[PDB]
Design a protein around this ligand. Structure first.
Ligand SMILES: NC1=N[C@H]2[C@H](COC(=O)NS(=O)(=O)O)N=C(N)N3CCC(O)(O)[C@]23N1
Length: 823
């Protein structure tokens, strides 16, 4: 296995070459491929000449476009603010679940708020070991009949682990820095070197605050406590011997880290434009680079083409003004060097390249026309900027080899993050750890919508779609054709987009490519986790059109299905709490009322033991034919084998089919509340149903009691939430207004329902909306968690343990990735 690293300069290639010799990662060999600039390396990776390089966030954006088709895969984790510990959040979520779902696991947290390594389930007496995230170490479960397991102690905090390593197992690390930790095991704000006498400030995860390093005998700056804001900040640095302010920058000389860098270009230009220092607003006033060319007298901006914007660079011959360390003024530390050597009056870079020392001739130029000390960048800056990242081809053919190499190299403490040859070679010298990003991350979710759009805005005039138009996302060709017919009558209120599946529709809406889509319940957890909101919902109650006639009216019964546990009156012995080992009938694997809701409750109350293992002999179509979930299944009265099959071939498949299995060879059936009334009181002519009586059956309540099948509203496993039309938070009001108006024209009582029907089509069944929808009803948003508000507390608890930590789609870690954005 090989990893070919692309280097952009002679210096970087030297450092990369040193790592080939000094860093021994077994099984994976590093190699170094030279190119002359950042852009030539991007092309080399696209072409397969190389596999990986580290890119500034601005280049991550440029590399994500069709010209290069690269994606970020690895980056240094950052923090925005202090957060609850995982264990205490989990405790709060589980304690907030539905109290009628008895016997659920509530985590046990220690005096620091972390998980005890031994976790136990009170109602079952089971215990097990957990990692730091409180996830079960599988295979450590111990029954109540035995002593609790012995579990490894929790991994130490960064500070305590860095302390232990610095002590190298020897009791005092003489002459070397030993971190000083607080009682929670985080870094004390002030750190001192035990031999040199120097002191400086660090944030809560131990990153040094620039401008605070203090030699012995001098007074230190004050160190802020509980600093969990570890985003990098764009700053403008100046010498204290000059006197101009930010608003007087016109006509000065400037040093920029680079034309494509977020801290050297996007951040300052963004502020120049907002303050109207730059006579430029759109691509009709020329290019942004040309306007900046007219603003400054002479600059060094590596990668630029305008002559005066390369005039201050000092690279020799063709190396001059190259996006490469062969230009000595390239990058953050090159721009600072350019100021230091007086080729510029101001340098544009980020806080991590500022001098560590408090005292000296440098300070910050704030956009509010004041100047402030180096250590006040959090209040004197041009914005937070995104993280930077290792990138590779979108195809990801080398992602595993790249990640494996860098994880092992860091375990072995190879010299990745410094060099005698220069600063910020290969990686930023400030980097301390590189971690894999979410597998489905791309530049949009890595940078975040705010910075992504801000960078796009410098390259093209982004025409913002109208708030009077809903772009509807369709998932198949018939849906798109029904939507084109809707657009034709809508007078411009409706437009259409196409995706392959509901999750790609969610992605389009997030990225501003569509505005709305109707989602099945099984997709709503992912949609709500990504930050979309229900705007309207499909109301399916055929017995009450009054909420559809008069909008805003009160709804007595939304009419969704209720999952129930159905048993016969004769079997008086069976209750909820003794269903273990009994015979059960399920509509089919994957059905929400017949499978997902019951499986969720069984899992919550029995330590995630398989619904397969919980019952005795069952029929649940879709299971493996050899398992005990198919033993009850009667394949086909016209024998072919079609047993336990997901078709009408299986006699026990579906709503009515699970009702058969109950009456014939069954003990309990998991069904919508409607199935019993639909097949008793002489409504199914079939022989088995005959004139079966609705009074002959009951439903099991979660409290061990029973009730007649007519009380499904108060004795159910869970009610289902309705299907929802989702959109971005800021578009809810427009989408509600447009859809409610469309519904007054083309709904079931629409004034123009002869021109178009929203809830049917000749092109197919359930296109865009379910054909049984009575109307769409505005979601009445309540002051609670949207998870509880949309799912209902019972469903949220039964299916998701009332937790925001389930991952039913690998999109969730990418769409919830946090960003370094401004207001
Ligand atoms: N905001 C809000 N309104 C409700 C409507 C459905 O309303 C009924 O289900 N009514 S019911 O039939 O009377 O139970 N939409 C939802 N997804 N929900 C789920 C929980 C909830 O019913 O409270 C509700 N949350």
């Amino acid at each position: 296995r090989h990893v070919q690293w692309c280097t952009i300069s002679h210096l970087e290639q030297k450092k990369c070459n040193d790592l080939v010799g000094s860093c021994n990662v077994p099984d994976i060999t590093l190699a170094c491929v030279y190119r002359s600039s950042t852009e030539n390396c991007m092309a080399a990776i696209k072409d397969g000449q190389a596999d990986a390089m580290f890119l500034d966030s601005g280049d991550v954006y440029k590399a994500s476009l069709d010209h290069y088709n690269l994606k970020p895969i690895i980056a240094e984790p950052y923090s925005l603010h202090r957060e609850l510990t995982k264990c205490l959040k989990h405790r709060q979520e589980s304690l907030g679940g539905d109290k009628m779902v008895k016997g659920r696991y509530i985590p046990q947290c220690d005096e620091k708020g972390n998980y005890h390594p031994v976790q136990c389930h009170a109602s079952t007496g089971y215990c097990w070991c957990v990692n730091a995230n409180g996830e079960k170490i599988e295979g450590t479960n111990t029954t109540p009949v035995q002593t609790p397991p012995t579990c490894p102690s929790q991994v130490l905090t960064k500070c305590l682990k860095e302390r232990q390593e610095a002590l190298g197992g020897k009791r005092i690390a003489i002459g070397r820095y030993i971190p000083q930790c607080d009682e929670q095991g985080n870094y004390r704000p002030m750190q001192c070197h035990g031999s040199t006498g120097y002191c400086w400030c660090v944030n809560a995860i131990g990153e040094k605050i620039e401008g605070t390093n203090t030699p012995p005998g001098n007074t230190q700056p004050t160190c802020q406590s509980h600093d969990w804001d570890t985003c990098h900040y764009a700053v403008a640095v100046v010498k204290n011997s000059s006197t101009f302010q930010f608003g007087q920058l016109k006509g000065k000389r400037s040093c920029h880290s680079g034309l494509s860098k977020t801290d050297g270009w996007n951040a300052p230009v963004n502020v120049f434009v907002e303050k109207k220092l730059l006579p430029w607003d759109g691509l009709a006033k020329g290019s942004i680079e040309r306007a900046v060319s007219k603003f400054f007298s002479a600059s060094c901006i590596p990668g630029a083409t305008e002559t005066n914007l390369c005039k201050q660079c000092i690279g020799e011959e063709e190396k001059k003004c190259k996006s490469s360390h062969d230009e000595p003024y390239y990058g953050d530390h090159g721009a600072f060097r350019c100021l230091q050597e007086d080729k510029g009056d101001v340098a544009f870079l980020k806080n991590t390249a500022l001098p560590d020392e408090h005292s000296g001739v440098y300070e910050l130029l704030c956009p509010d026309n004041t100047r402030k000390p180096l250590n006040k960048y959090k209040e004197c800056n041009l914005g937070k900027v995104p993280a930077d990242a290792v990138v590779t081809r979108k195809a990801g053919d080398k992602t595993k080899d790249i990640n494996d190499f860098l994880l092992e190299a860091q375990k072995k403490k190879c010299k990745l993050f410094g060099s005698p040859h220069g600063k910020d070679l290969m990686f930023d010298d400030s980097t301390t750890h590189l971690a894999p990003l979410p597998s489905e991350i791309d530049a949009f979710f890595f940078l975040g919508v705010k910075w992504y759009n801000a960078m796009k805005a410098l390259t093209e005039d982004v025409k913002l779609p109208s708030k009077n138009k809903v772009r509807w996302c369709t998932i198949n060709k018939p849906e798109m054709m029904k939507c084109k017919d809707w657009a034709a009558v809508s007078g411009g209120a409706i437009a259409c987009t196409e995706a392959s599946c509901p999750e790609h529709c969610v992605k389009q809406i997030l990225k501003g490519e569509a505005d709305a889509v109707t989602l099945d319940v099984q997709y709503m957890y992912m949609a709500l986790m990504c930050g979309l909101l229900p705007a309207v919902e499909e109301y399916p109650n055929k017995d009450d059109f009054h909420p559809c006639q008069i909008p805003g009216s009160t709804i007595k019964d939304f009419g969704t299905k209720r999952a129930v546990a159905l048993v016969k009156k004769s079997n008086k012995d069976i209750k909820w709490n003794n269903l273990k080992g009994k015979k059960s009938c399920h509509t089919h694997v994957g059905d929400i009322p017949g499978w997902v809701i019951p499986a969720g409750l069984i899992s919550n109350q029995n330590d995630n033991i398989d619904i397969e293992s919980f019952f005795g002999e069952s029929c649940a179509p879709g299971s493996d034919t050899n398992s005990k979930l198919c033993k009850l299944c009667i394949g086909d009265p016209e024998n072919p084998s079609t047993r336990c099959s997901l078709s009408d071939k299986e006699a026990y498949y579906g709503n009515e089919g699970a009702f058969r299995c109950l009456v014939e060879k069954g003990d309990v059936a998991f069904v919508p509340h409607t199935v019993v009334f639909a097949n008793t009181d002489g409504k199914n002519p079939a022989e088995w149903a005959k004139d079966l009586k609705s009074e002959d059956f009951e439903i099991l309540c979660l409290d061990g009691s029973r009730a007649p099948v007519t009380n499904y509203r108060g004795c159910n496993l869970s009610g289902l939430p309705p299907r929802a039309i989702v959109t971005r938070e800021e578009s809810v009001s427009d989408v509600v207004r447009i859809l409610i108006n469309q519904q007054s024209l083309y709904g079931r009582n629409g004034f123009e329902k002869d021109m178009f029907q929203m809830f049917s089509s000749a092109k197919g069944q359930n296109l865009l909306f379910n054909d049984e929808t009575q109307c769409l009803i505005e979601f009445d948003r309540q002051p609670k968690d949207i998870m509880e508000d949309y799912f209902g507390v019972r469903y949220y608890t039964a299916v998701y343990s009332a937790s925001r930590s389930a991952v039913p789609s690998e999109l969730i870690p990418a769409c919830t990735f946090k960003h370094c954005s401004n207001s």
